[PDB]
């Protein structure tokens, strides 16, 4: 027989039990999707700075 | 759809690795071998009693196939494949469109 199709009733209450957690931030995010030409150079730049604080 | 019998496009061949002229044909499947391992297994499975031992497709829906082009490089002879979208009519080096002509009666 026919039934209910859809509702969001009760869904915000479920969502707020274990809260809506903001996603958590770090110093130093991933260089993921950053332009490869930039990344390739940036390796070379960081190499030299190590060989210099030594 | 109408596509030209030649095409300058990239050639992967190790003596090219550059755009070269290609002859363009249509791909045709190829005759199924009797000693392809799947065919040999099917033959063994079908032998004896038990009737049809594997599915047999009936519920055809499509009315087209995708066209595949065999591009052969005219220098090195390396081949490449390009899939076109579905179409009902396909021709290779057909007569090109004239613009601005009287559609005859």
């Amino acid at each position: 027989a026919k039934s209910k199709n859809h509702t969001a009733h009760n869904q915000t209450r479920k969502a707020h039990r274990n809260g809506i957690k903001k996603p958590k931030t770090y110093k130093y995010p991933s260089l993921k999707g950053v332009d490869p030409k930039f990344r390739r150079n940036h390796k070379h730049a960081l190499h030299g700075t190590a060989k210099a604080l030594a | 759809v109408n596509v030209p019998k030649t095409r300058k496009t990239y050639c992967k061949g190790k003596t090219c690795r550059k755009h070269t002229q290609h002859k363009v044909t249509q791909y045709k499947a190829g005759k199924a071998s009797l000693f392809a391992q799947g065919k040999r297994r099917y033959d063994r499975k079908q032998s004896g009693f038990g009737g049809q031992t594997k599915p047999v497709f009936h519920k055809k829906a499509k009315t087209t196939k995708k066209v595949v082009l065999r591009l052969e490089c005219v220098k090195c002879k390396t081949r490449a494949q390009l899939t076109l979208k579905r179409c009902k009519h396909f021709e290779l080096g057909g007569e090109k469109k004239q613009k601005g002509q009287a559609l005859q009666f």
Partner: protein
């Protein structure tokens, strides 16, 4: 061959087992021969046997027995 001895070829099961013709007994005609001789002369012991002849309908064997 051994025709499956089932009434009117009805097998009463899945299609793999609908065979009646083209089935074959797992012992040789030679073994049938020894067995039928063995039963006729139950005081004897079948030692061995050998082929002597055949036509379309029959194969012929000789069976060696010991008392």
């Amino acid at each position: 061959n051994r025709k499956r001895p089932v009434p009117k070829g009805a097998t009463y099961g899945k299609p793999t087992n609908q065979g009646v013709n083209e089935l074959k007994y797992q012992r040789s005609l030679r073994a049938t021969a020894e067995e039928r001789v063995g039963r006729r002369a139950a005081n004897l012991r079948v030692l061995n046997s050998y082929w002597v002849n055949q036509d379309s309908t029959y194969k012929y064997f000789e069976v060696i027995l010991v008392d």
